[PDB]
Design a protein around this ligand. Structure first.
Ligand SMILES: [Ca+2]
Ligand SMILES: [Ca+2]
Ligand SMILES: [Ca+2]
Ligand SMILES: [Zn+2]
Ligand SMILES: [Zn+2]
Ligand SMILES: [Zn+2]
Length: 425
């Protein structure tokens, strides 16, 4: 019950490179010989049965295999007695057809009678490959395209977990990943010219790509555009991947080689946000295609029990404006350090007004929401920050307490020009 490597179908034959093939696909693998029913390679013309010529490849696999050179294995005798041979487990082509030798209790078992058999082993090249699984698993994968000034390390540190595997193409990129992560598990590859640190006992695995499928929970692909195409197909035969790449640019001819699967794979462009924290980005994410990544610190969100006038007051309706308060609609285009979302009247928020209101604040947003109406339009949890805020000249502490001027403990945050000038005293 062996399935074809290209299509699903039953596979009584195999390539020299270890790919199982159905009878149809025996004639569309130009990479290496595939021995057929007549005992010669398909398309060889060795007898009249193998005269029918080879066709062009029917799979992207064939295209990647154009760079994977086939070196013939040595012809060695498989001595057999009572279904036992000293040769290593594997799959061998003999005069009696393709035979498997499997390790067992008594020994390495083989299903053919006693004698000595000239035999050539199948290579491991396409052992793991299954293109129907690739096609399947490519749809359930993400290709995360980075931004111009990449904080993809920052993105990746927030994403990984202890049981994850991060595949990475070269020794240097493995060393880069091990450095970016603090604690991680790995095996230092033999023959390296690099100073690897000692591997920790916990954290995400950091495997070299050529090593292949190490079972784990969520697998990642570091430097996806630089990776070995066949090794990517190896991975996609067993698991789905989160593939991490840099920002696209129209390169010249020859300057872009990358595995074809990424151009099929579901894509997600990252966008850098310098305006407000990740918590705000999370809340507004449903309004935008691109994944919003915050470089700057967390924006404070406080739900106040009574009305307040911290920073620029925003409110849906003109009826509720008091003092220097402004409507949400008229605040479009503007930007402040601190904002007070003032919601004294029921059913006064759609998303579009909330979206504007939430995206005006740089450092803090206080929300008087006695009707609990922001819930029905937005997911914006309470989020403290250990910082001394400054706004017109009062100053709110880390626990939102109107503190004294020069009551020192935490650091102070304030990007407004006139505010920063009056903080010098
Ligand atoms: Ca024929
Ligand atoms: Ca070609
Ligand atoms: Ca209005
Ligand atoms: Zn097939
Ligand atoms: Zn082959
Ligand atoms: Zn033949």
């Amino acid at each position: 019950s062996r399935m074809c490597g290209y299509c699903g179908a039953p596979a009584p034959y195999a390539t020299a490179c270890g790919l199982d093939v159905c009878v149809y696909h025996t004639h569309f693998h130009q990479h290496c010989p595939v021995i057929i029913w007549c005992g010669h390679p398909a398309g060889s013309g060795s007898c009249s049965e193998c005269e029918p010529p080879l066709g062009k490849g029917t799979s992207p696999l064939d295209e990647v295999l154009e760079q994977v050179p086939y070196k013939p294995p040595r012809t060695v005798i498989m001595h057999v007695e009572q279904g036992l041979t000293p040769l290593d487990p594997g799959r061998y082509q003999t005069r009696r057809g393709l035979v498997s030798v499997r390790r067992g209790i008594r020994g390495n078992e083989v299903d053919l009678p006693d004698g000595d058999y000239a035999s050539t082993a199948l290579l491991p090249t396409c052992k793991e490959i299954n293109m129907v699984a690739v096609a399947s698993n490519v749809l359930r994968s993400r290709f995360i395209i980075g931004p111009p000034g990449a904080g993809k390390t920052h993105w990746l540190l927030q994403q990984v977990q202890d049981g994850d595997v991060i595949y990475t193409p070269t020794h240097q990129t493995m060393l880069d990943m091990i450095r970016a992560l603090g604690t991680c598990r790995f095996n230092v590859p033999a023959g390296t010219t690099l100073q690897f640190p000692a591997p920790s006992r916990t954290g995400p695995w950091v495997r070299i790509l050529a090593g292949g499928w190490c079972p784990g929970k969520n697998s990642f692909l570091d430097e996806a555009a630089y990776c070995n195409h066949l090794d990517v197909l190896r991975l996609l035969s067993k698991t789905t991947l989160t593939c991490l790449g840099d920002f696209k640019q129209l390169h010249p001819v020859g300057f872009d080689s990358h595995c074809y699967v990424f151009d099929i794979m579901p894509q997600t462009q990252l966008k850098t946000i310098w305006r407000f924290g990740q918590n705000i980005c999370d809340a507004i994410q449903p309004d935008y295609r691109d994944k919003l990544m915050s470089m700057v610190n967390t924006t404070r969100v406080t739900y106040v029990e009574k009305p307040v006038r911290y920073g620029q007051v925003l409110t849906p309706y003109h009826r509720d404006r008091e003092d220097s308060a402004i409507t949400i609609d008229s605040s479009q285009g503007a930007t402040f350090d601190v904002v007070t979302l003032h919601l004294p009247t029921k059913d006064s928020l759609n998303r579009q007004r909330a979206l504007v209101a939430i995206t005006r604040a740089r450092h803090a947003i206080f929300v008087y929401d006695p009707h609990r109406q922001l819930q029905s339009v937005f997911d914006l949890p309470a989020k403290g920050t250990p910082v001394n805020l400054a706004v017109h000249r009062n100053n709110r502490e880390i626990t939102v307490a109107q503190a004294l001027g020069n009551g020192d403990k935490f650091r102070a945050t304030d990007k407004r020009v006139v505010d920063s000038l009056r903080a010098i005293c």
